[PDB]
Amino acid sequence: TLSQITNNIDPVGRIQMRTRRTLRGHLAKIYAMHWGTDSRLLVSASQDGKLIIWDSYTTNKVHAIPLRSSWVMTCAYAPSGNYVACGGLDNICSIYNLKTREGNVRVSRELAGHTGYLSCCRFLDDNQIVTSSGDTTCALWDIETGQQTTTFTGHTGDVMSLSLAPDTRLFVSGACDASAKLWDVREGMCRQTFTGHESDINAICFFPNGNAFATGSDDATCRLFDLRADQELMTYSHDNIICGITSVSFSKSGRLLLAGYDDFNCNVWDALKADRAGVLAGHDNRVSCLGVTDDGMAVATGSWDSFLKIWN
Amino acid sequence: LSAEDKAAVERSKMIDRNLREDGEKAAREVKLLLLIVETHFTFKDLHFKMFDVSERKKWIHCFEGVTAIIFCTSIILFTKEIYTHFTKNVQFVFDAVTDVIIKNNLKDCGLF
């Protein structure tokens, strides 16, 4: 098993980090955030109906895009940087062009066809984007035409999480039914399926190598599944913390495993050995979102207190 | 700072001013959760957004921030103040939410 092999591995030690930055330009709960590939600009959705582009180094506000619907659950930042996206209880996904000639920000396209709300969305290119919905399915899109190209039905309950592979060829997503399924973008078939949890899966992320993923459930548990052994390798639970898990994220090497809870904290777990090494406590209310840069330099953490901090 | 960083800071300050203006504009808005069909109605210099809505996790995930829940937070019936009533209904909702807002302000200022 994993524990037997990892017994001889030396531990990590206590993890201490502080709020280097505090970004204060929102007035309601923050539900999502996403880093730019440069790991300097980041976008934030809030229930105030606003979407602010942040200069992380100076705390400068680069853009402030107003939204038609204030009920938003998702952000996205195109890898090129020219487009952001967002979705929520409008059941549509809006795309914004950040680099126009008139000097403003305009909506490029609105995507319609999903029957249920939008849970997550992540660009694959400037023209491709995969979204998740409460219809128990997902889809691929063409933003130059606005029509779906694929559909990935088969789940029983609502899909609440989504995680593109590093190559964006494979795709795993969790559902209200406690199972995660591996989807192929270019074939539209469920390659693998996984089980083991007992509650709705709220967050899912991909290991930096693409051979595994982490499933954070609403019953205070996480598990490390694999795409070759096709079974869980570890658990992450503690009797002191019995609540939901609201976010999950690895680090640049996969040796550390961030997380978020309804207990106003972000317990810094460990991957190889389940022993918990670290805690972050700097938020008045619970933490919705949790992201780690591409260069592993910082960890942004938005929360229901309308502030988001940078921890290093 | 250089001549361009200062201009960027000026732009950031202008964005801050506009965000403050928009926030002050939205301080006269109320979300009357009802428990999709959305009824917006104004009354006595105050707007109301009523939302009509199968799972307990859905309600907690996106509606815990509402002001005063109305069932035909606080309770309006037709910390957790409960009010009952049966042209007069709108005024009753107005009074209930005004009380809720005043109590929330007092809680914010620590006097509660």
Epitope: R40, L41, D55, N60, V62, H63, R101, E102, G103, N104 | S2, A3, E4, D5, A7, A8, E10, R11, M14
Partner: single-chain antibody, 231 residues
Framework: VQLVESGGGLVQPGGSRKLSCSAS????????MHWVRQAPEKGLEWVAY????????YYADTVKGRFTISRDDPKNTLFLQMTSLRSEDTAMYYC??????????????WGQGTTLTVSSDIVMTQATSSVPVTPGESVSISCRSS???????????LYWFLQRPGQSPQLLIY???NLASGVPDRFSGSGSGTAFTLTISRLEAEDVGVYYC?????????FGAGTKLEL
């Protein structure tokens, strides 16, 4: 996007004049505006500047006091009120726009000037101003600053412009490395502090004109002498 100026003409010495510019096709209030003039036989010379929201104004040390700059946002108009004119102010005046955030390109669009006739500082050198050119050939322009334009945050502020005969200048490269939109990929720029160059791969048609280099680090903005290419 259009920028067109009015006014100008012939004015006796000591008589006040007013120049105006109208803007259409973009968000006027989100851009800073500049005035730039050039004598009939000399190069460009920055005159005055007003920021977005009118919260900051700058003037040259040769027209300070006499001139004034102001903008009307609802009417999308920029004004230049000038008094006590002299023979030193006989030049064609251009209007330029600039927007400043992380990653933007200032000095994008130039207007069409209006001719006016009347009856400490960073210095740069572009003494090379006559070089023969041949089609399908590569030439390198030079530009040197008195002090180091590189800043602590990693940005070096050197801008390149090209003025085709009978037209207004256009932006080629901003901050010494980034290529402007609509500019062919054969234009390249490089060079450490106080030593900069511009590179062109193929010298085809429409690449002939006068090239200038400008610095944006200290608010008095100084242009180079200019480099002219001929067939």
């Amino acid at each position: 996007v259009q920028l067109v100026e009015s006014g100008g003409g012939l004015v006796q010495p000591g008589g006040s004049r007013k120049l105006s510019c109208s803007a259409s096709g973009f968000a006027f209030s989100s851009f800073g505006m500049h005035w730039v003039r050039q004598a009939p036989e000399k190069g460009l010379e920055w005159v005055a500047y007003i920021s977005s929201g009118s919260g900051t104004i700058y003037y040259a040390d040769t027209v300070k006091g006499r001139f004034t700059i102001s903008r009307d946002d609802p009417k999308n108009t920029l004004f230049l009120q000038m008094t006590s004119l002299r023979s030193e102010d006989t030049a064609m005046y251009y209007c330029v726009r600039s927007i400043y955030y992380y990653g933007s390109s200032p000095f994008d669009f130039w207007g069409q000037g209006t001719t006016l006739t009347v009856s400490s500082d960073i210095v740069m050198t572009q003494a090379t101003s006559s070089v023969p050119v041949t089609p399908g050939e590569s030439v390198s322009i030079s530009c040197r600053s008195s002090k180091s334009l590189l800043h602590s945050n990693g940005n070096t502020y050197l801008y390149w412009f090209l003025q085709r005969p009978g037209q207004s200048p256009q932006l080629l490269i901003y901050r010494m490395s980034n290529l402007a939109s609509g500019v062919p990929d054969r234009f390249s720029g490089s060079g450490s502090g106080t030593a900069f160059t511009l590179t062109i791969s193929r010298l085809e048609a429409e690449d002939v004109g006068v090239y200038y280099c400008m610095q944006h680090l200290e608010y008095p903005l100084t242009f180079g002498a200019g480099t002219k290419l001929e067939l």
